Amino acid sequence: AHCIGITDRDFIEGVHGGTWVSATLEQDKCVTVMAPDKPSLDISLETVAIDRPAEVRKVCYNAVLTHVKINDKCPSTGEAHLAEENEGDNACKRTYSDRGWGNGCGLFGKGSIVACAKFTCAKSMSLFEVDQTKIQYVIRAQLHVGAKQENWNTDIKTLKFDALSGSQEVEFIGYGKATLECQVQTAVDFGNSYIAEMETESWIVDRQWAQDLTLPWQSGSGGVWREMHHLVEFEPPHAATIRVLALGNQEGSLKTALTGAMRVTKDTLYKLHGGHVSCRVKLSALTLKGTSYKICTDKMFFVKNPTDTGHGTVVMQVKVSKGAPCRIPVIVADDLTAAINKGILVTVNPIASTNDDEVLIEVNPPFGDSYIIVGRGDSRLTYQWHKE
Amino acid sequence: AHCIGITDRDFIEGVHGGTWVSATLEQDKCVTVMAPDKPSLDISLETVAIDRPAEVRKVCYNAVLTHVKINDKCPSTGEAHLAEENEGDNACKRTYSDRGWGNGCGLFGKGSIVACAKFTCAKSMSLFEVDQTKIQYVIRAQLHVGAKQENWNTDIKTLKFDALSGSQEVEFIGYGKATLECQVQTAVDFGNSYIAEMETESWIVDRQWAQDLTLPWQSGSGGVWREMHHLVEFEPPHAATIRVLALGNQEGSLKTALTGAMRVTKDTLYKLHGGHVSCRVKLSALTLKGTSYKICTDKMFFVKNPTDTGHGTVVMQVKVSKGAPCRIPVIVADDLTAAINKGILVTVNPIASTNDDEVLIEVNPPFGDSYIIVGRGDSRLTYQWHKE
């Protein structure tokens, strides 16, 4: 809603005896529900969202190294010990260098040696929990009245459905109301999942995949980086010296590992670019408005000519300059002499309540050549339409 | 050279009639050539190197994007064109957005749209050529005299062999000379190769691997980054907007793709941590010195006791306080009563030319229990040795 201007669009015809009409809603997609002698309803999934999710983990992908210290003990001088060893924020390794007269010591053998470095995470990625029950589903509902596009964001009602809310009503002024009974689907799209974010970007990731990452990880309480060795390289000892290096920035590798995953985007609250809702829509309480208005008899004009919507329908915008509250007669006939309407009106029972009102009409013309006729008398507007 | 203090060590015995002795030299490894009635020769591959290599390519692994510009034309308004399209430092993409009344345009259809961004390489990797004919091979040669370790870097000669040099002579003061005829081996270690460096670190990479890298690449002459799209992401068009993002830092993935590759390190000239030289060593012109000296008869002392080298030999360091130019008698008998020498002397014919000279001895004792005897009279030093 409004489903014109949304490329992916489906139509569902309600039936005369029918009360409910079921429809599955996906994002970047919308549905127009129609019923005979009833206003058409535009329904669409606006956003899926999770507000205030809790941090489960952090994962470091860029780490700098500082303060490299080393302890070197000659053969038979015993095991080496660094003071900066049994600390927490340091990466340490135990090994044995080959030492002899060539480098200090008096014996030829294995001289114990220890190396430590200060570990600080330059850049990391946050892992939040995905509680499927906390997920809210926002749905746009808006009737097909003669509303200009510039007023579409002034007529749209929005409904939020938890993992389980009840039925919810949407009433429109003068048209009655609809009842939505939407069940959310958070299984194959909300199953094992973390919300993972780097800097500005976020994604939905497999929990097992996130936990199986070969990178240092935190708990958001204690700033103790676990499994640091994933980003620290210890070259074999020369004699006394041991070179300790930082591995590269893992931003790229992670981002390639993340291709395909559903995107997530914040705003002041996490927007989910996916998911779907299966819905049941009650239409019986919906009513047509202005069925007792007079007929707009004064000359009318096309503010916007009949143009192809791409959905197999055509839209035009008509100004009414003198008719008081009145209804606009719109048909699609195969001949200018026949008033036999062959077109299906999506904008059911057009209307003009104020003068200089620009009402939007949408019709579904028949296959073949035809004429769009709006109004009566010489005043009436006619437009040739050819549907292949 | 000196092969004591170098763990990986081999012994090659020359034969009485022999003239040439073959030996393969590898880095972090050394060979000690022995010949009866001749000074032992310490030979080792110091460094492999390439000086002033020519740049073949550059390859961008971190790029930042700036000045994103976009041109949006409505349906049937024609093809869109940016002014910044065909400048060279801009990454650009042509596409079609879905446009209608919902976003500006008056028709419903494909609106042409172009997106460009300024490309600048934040961090890159350099690729140099590996000319197998330009590679030089530095070899350490040094005789087994009674030289202290603290003088080892004062007695070593160094020879450079091109991919094809001739035989080279090394002569030592008082001991004659040796001749090296070393053929280098630069096939399976540098065949398809580039020298690839990032910041401080370098490697030897497969040429075909380097060329198949899915990253932007330069020629060092013109600063035109080819195939930029490897580090640029264009999201699908909304209506007018197109988001242009930079891909992550590729330092990490590169570094993991480089694991195993032979390392390279600079110094003021590129040191190569690999390779080997097959050699033929001439020993006939090599002579023993001081065989006409008198015998050191005055009391001597162990500056450094006989200690296991781990090479199956023992080393000690003896100070001669009073003997003039004189030779030191050393044997390894099985008994203090037997002068029968069962030990093999690596430091052939020990020597002291000045008083308070600390000459280094190395012997190969026999398996079992034995005695190391140095000097004669009561003045002689004895040391109990047990070789399992």
- Our CA angle for B156, B346, B3, nearest 5°, is 40
CATH number of the structural domain spanning residue B56: 3.30.67.10
CATH number of the structural domain spanning residue A109: 3.30.387.10
End-to-end CA distance of chain A: 28
Its sign, for the CA torsion A11, A12, A16, A20, is negative
User: Percentage helix, strand, coil, to 5, in chain B?
Assistant: 5, 50, 45
Q: Are residues A279 and A167 in the same domain?
A: yes
- CA–CA separation, B302 and B360 (whole Å): 10
Q: Which residues contact A319 (CB under 8 A, 6 or more apart)?
A: A300, A301, A303, A356, A357, A358
Q: Are residues B278 and B360 in the same domain?
A: no
Interface contact B309, partner A, CB < 8 A: yes
Q: Are residues A99 and A167 in the same domain?
A: no
- Are A4 and B101 an interchain contact pair (Cβ–Cβ within 8 Å)? yes
Q: Would you call B357 exposed, middle or buried from its count of C-beta atoms within 10 A (0-12, 13-18, 19+)? A: middle
Neighbouring C-beta atoms of residue B212, cutoff 10 Å: 8
Interface contact A138, partner B, CB < 8 A: no
Interface contact B249, partner A, CB < 8 A: yes
CATH number of the structural domain spanning residue B147: 2.60.98.10
Q: Are residues A204 and A317 in the same domain?
A: no
Task: Tell me which residue range forms the domain holding B385.
Answer: 289-388
User: Percentage helix, strand, coil, to 5, in chain A?
Assistant: 5, 50, 45
CATH number of the structural domain spanning residue A363: 2.60.40.350
Helix (H) or strand (E) holding B254: helix B251-257
Nearest Cα residue to B223 out of B87, B67, B131: B87
Neighbouring C-beta atoms of residue A175, cutoff 10 Å: 19
Q: Are residues A169 and A266 in the same domain?
A: yes
Closest residue of A to B152, CA-based?
A102
Q: Collapsing DSSP states into helix, strand and coil, what is residue A228?
A: helix
- CA–CA separation, B228 and B32 (whole Å): 55
Residues in chain A: 388
- CA–CA separation, B265 and B22 (whole Å): 30
- CA–CA separation, B295 and B145 (whole Å): 17
Q: How far is CA B306 from CA A131, B139, B317, B374, in A?
A: 73, 29, 8, 11
Question: Determination method here?
Answer: X-ray
- CA–CA separation, A352 and B277 (whole Å): 97
Q: Are residues B169 and B35 in the same domain?
A: yes
Residue among B61, B101, B252 whose CB faces A149 most closely: B101
Q: Are residues B35 and B156 in the same domain?
A: yes
Q: Are residues B182 and B330 in the same domain?
A: no
Q: Are residues B108 and B138 in the same domain?
A: no
Measured between beta carbons, the chain B residues lying within 8 angstroms of A315 are 101
Residue among B100, B253, B308 whose CB faces A253 most closely: B253
Q: Are residues A207 and A220 in the same domain?
A: yes
- CA–CA separation, A210 and A217 (whole Å): 10
Q: How many domains does one find in chain A?
A: 4
Q: Are residues B169 and B137 in the same domain?
A: yes
The first and second tokens of residue A365, run together, are: 């013309």
Q: How far is CA A329 from CA A379, A381, B292, in A?
A: 12, 11, 134
Q: Are residues B220 and B78 in the same domain?
A: no
